[PDB]
């Protein structure tokens, strides 16, 4: 999840936007 | 936008920037 | 632990100390 | 709410634990 | 992306996160 | 400019982007 | 509350939100 | 200390109070 | 090296960059 | 104390430093 | 004062902490 | 540049004064 896709991989901006509610 | 990692307290406060009013939800263990 | 005044960013940041890898959700009015 | 609690006048982390998943 | 209220360092830790390793200049007035 | 703008006002990211290298 | 790895500023910002009015110190070479 | 034990290795919130004046 | 205004975390922060390993005592009033 | 005098006022790095340990 | 590494957002804060009024740049690609 | 002197080596307060305007 987020961790393993922002953290441990890098992730975008645009990504990190999934987890708005 | 550039991209890169993101890790503990550093993840949360991009979350704050990106969602900002919008609210999110943190969830490490998915 | 003592009483907080948490604005911002600093909110979140308080809420990932405190919640940690159960994670958490930030949930602004409006 | 909360965030608009620990902003305007404070909160305590007991109340913070609240939010926890 | 939401709009942004972003005072003294927050304003930088912003520009880092938008920005990355593209680099940015942080020039405040006077 | 910026610095103040989004201080005292409210800015962007897309705003900000305009001060990247 | 969780556990977890706090290190450089991460470690006295946490001191800060648990202590808070009542201070504390921060000792790395104890 | 306090880096060997909430660093190095984890701590909890508790622990850091023990850092408290 | 310029003049600050440093509230809060941001303190305790600017506390940790300027003292280091050398540590430092955080003490507010009451 | 430095705590107030920071945020009330302003201060200097070199004023921080005496709170070093 | 004393040394250290600062990575990230960490370097930026510092660079805030230090130049302040008279802003700075950050350049990872140089 | 202050990537590899900063951060994977280390720096000083001082070296740090170069990278401001
Ligand atoms: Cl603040
Ligand atoms: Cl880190
Ligand atoms: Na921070
Ligand atoms: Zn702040
Ligand atoms: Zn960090």
Same mark, same amino acid.
């Given at each position: 999840? =987020?961790? +393993?896709?922002?953290?441990? $991989? =890098?992730? $975008?901006? #645009?990504?990190? +936007? @999934? #987890?708005? @509610? | !936008? &550039?991209?890169? %990692?993101? *890790?503990?307290? %550093?993840? &949360?406060?991009?979350?704050?920037? &990106? *969602?900002?009013?919008?609210? !999110?939800?943190?969830?490490?263990?998915?």
């Amino acid at each position: 999840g =987020i961790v +393993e896709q922002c953290c441990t $991989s =890098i992730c $975008s901006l #645009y990504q990190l +936007e @999934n #987890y708005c @509610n | !936008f &550039v991209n890169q %990692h993101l *890790c503990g307290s %550093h993840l &949360v406060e991009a979350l704050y920037l &990106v *969602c900002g009013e919008r609210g !999110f939800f943190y969830t490490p263990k998915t």
